[PDB]
Symmetry: C2
Subunit: 180 residues, 2 copies
């Protein structure tokens, strides 16, 4: 299909939910065509942030980023936020025409909040539209409870790029099972 | 599980899109069941009233209609509305679930996957904008869902 009909899937991992204090610690990007066919995997980058920020994280955040092995990789990182944005923006410019492709993901409103503040040039390459798999998830649970039960459970967190894969798989499941 | 499957619909008008500088001009809220039937209509406030009182009016309304932390925020391009709400109405957002139901996601899937249905798919107040967003979602349920 047309490059203007491609989707830009992102997944971010952050120190918390507070847009004033918290920072982006991991990011991944993936391109699919309009029908969710896999076109190209983008960078998977672990971004350096201070130790003070990593220790002030919520008890849920501290354990979940520890078992996935992220906090260790954040502490050994040489990638700055600015360097990561340059990598992500370069990749999407090579894959999509400017300001025409949507952001896609799971509860991707949360990621957009952090991308709007900390990666505004990357966000200018994207159109205003959002494709949020979690809106489809909520409608599946209500309107198609039988199909919702058969969907696979999500795997344990590894890296942001694997989380995007699970989000794509989830929306493909919805298309395959609850769309006309 | 019928109560946890209800939806908290909102629509807001702001002075712009910057969270640090812009403010909430208008807000409306209403509750639908899981099948989109309107169970109760809330107030359509011009912010005339204050933001903290508007939050008390809306928090009182959703506390007598849905259980805390189980029902999502629902709307059309509600990602921008959720940003202004998390900041300026954090006690209201504490009553809702972390996920949201955004009709603009369904519109976009309709546009791509159902171009024919998309071509024949279907405001002065913010409450009227919610009513039209529900009719838009009901159209997608009927025309593109199995």
């Amino acid at each position: 299909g047309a490059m203007a009909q491609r989707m830009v899937w992102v997944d971010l991992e952050m120190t918390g939910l507070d847009i004033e204090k918290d920072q982006i610690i991991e990011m991944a990007c993936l391109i699919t065509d309009s029908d969710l066919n896999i076109l190209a995997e983008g960078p998977n980058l672990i971004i350096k942030q201070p130790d003070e920020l990593l220790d002030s994280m919520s008890d849920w955040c501290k354990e979940h980023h520890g078992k996935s092995g992220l906090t260790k990789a954040v502490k050994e990182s040489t990638i700055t936020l600015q360097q990561a944005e340059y990598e992500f923006l370069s990749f999407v410019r090579q894959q999509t025409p400017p300001g025409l492709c949507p952001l896609a993901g799971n509860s991707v409103h949360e990621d957009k909040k952090f991308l709007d503040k900390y990666m505004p040039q990357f966000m200018k390459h994207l159109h205003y539209r959002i494709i949020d798999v979690s809106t489809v998830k909520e409608l599946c649970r209500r309107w198609y409870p039988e199909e919702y039960e058969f969907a696979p459970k999500k795997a344990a967190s590894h890296r942001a790029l694997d989380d995007i894969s699970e989000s794509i798989k989830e929306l493909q499941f919805y298309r395959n099972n609850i769309f006309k």
